[PDB]
Structure to design on (544 residues):
């Protein structure tokens, strides 16, 4: 199972059908990836939610401006969200090797020794780690 | 203002963002067109909902099966809905001039003496009336 | 392999990305299903095409009117195209059992003793057969 | 008329119907903005094409990877493009007032003394200019 891929699919799929929110099973590691998506503007925010004893994390999805002429659909904010490292085929990179995602117009989340950081943060703290996902 | 075309545009636009329901200011006539739209399968149903004294009609939109392959969007049931008889540009058809919409694979909804009728109902009752809208 | 499903997927997939045409490997049976899709308005037409010795059938896709406000995308004509009968799980129906597809607002193609016919034709010639697909 | 916004709208609309190319009436300036759009990856390229004496620019649109699961639509590369400085509503920014578009994950394209420059190029050359459009 890859929980993290399963969260990111649950998120991308809820935006594709313009939902206000989506609940993924709670975890500290998922909570910190949500903590970065929220600070960087890809989601509105999240909130812990216990539904009949089980912990969930309720993600509040964000949508951008109305489209340029009578088309009701908002412009999306998460255009591409995707796993890199994973179950069976892991990807690690060191401080010198952190890629600039989509020419600087995208962010990559890394799990590093100093915690879950964006590639721009990682580089600054001088850490490398596991490339969890890329998003723009 | 055109009443009826607000309601049709608001049903069209709710479905294009996969909304569970949309509310239209209530009216005997609006109830009629929804009574017909729901029965020919294009909406789930409606409830007259008064929200704050003012009557509303809570249209419960219908969507079909998910698509073939991981595409999260349901397939739609309302694929086309448009007002034909505008105000100041009224269209009336007398029975033999009731048109066949989309080769016979769409409905027209008439307003007639015999009530509010779908095109085959108007032909069967032999009535003529004003052409409200077409939907397929 | 199910050639017929593979044609219908090739067609549905080309409309989803607004292509002018698509070439499926030629066959008499595929040519007659195209002959009905064309007469009923779901495609513009088709044309036989030999490309380096191999026979193909080039389908010319049809699109409906511009959308109701600055959205460039035409309104589609084939909304739903799908196999019923198939490899491994076949479906036959007799003259009395031919379903009305989508309440009369859709067509079903049947392979019958009197050839490939629509359900409306089949019923008229008094034949039943194999439900190849439904489309609206 | 606004020239530039015709070109931007025609690139936007071509991609929304997955067109391989779109032609815009040629111009030194249009060449400049395309020179920049192609180099930051948002279009494949262009060819000045004269079609019938009148010069045209044949923009070759770029689209990314197909999506995850049988969804035939490629993912887009141009997700947002809009004219900021209109005619009769001109916007000029002097270097320190050059904005950061979409948190730093989008580009602005300036017209300046030092040529046609993307926002970081204008900050690096320390130039100011008029704000043509934003794209991410």
């Amino acid at each position: 199972t890859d929980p993290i891929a399963d969260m990111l699919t649950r998120i991308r799929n809820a935006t594709r059908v313009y939902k206000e929110s989506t609940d993924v099973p709670a975890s500290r590691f998922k909570e910190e990836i949500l903590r970065i998506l929220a600070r960087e503007g890809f989601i509105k925010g999240y909130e812990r939610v216990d539904v009949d004893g089980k912990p969930y994390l309720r993600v509040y999805l964000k949508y951008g401006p109305r489209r340029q002429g009578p088309d009701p659909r908002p412009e999306q904010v998460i255009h591409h969200i995707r796993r890199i490292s994973k179950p069976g085929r892991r990807v690690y990179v060191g401080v010198k090797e952190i890629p600039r995602v989509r020419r600087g117009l995208g962010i990559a989340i890394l799990s590093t020794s100093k915690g879950v950081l964006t590639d721009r943060e990682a580089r600054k703290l001088g850490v490398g780690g596991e490339l969890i996902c890329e998003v723009w």
Remarks:
- Residues 3 and 30 of chain C are 8 Å apart (CA to CA).
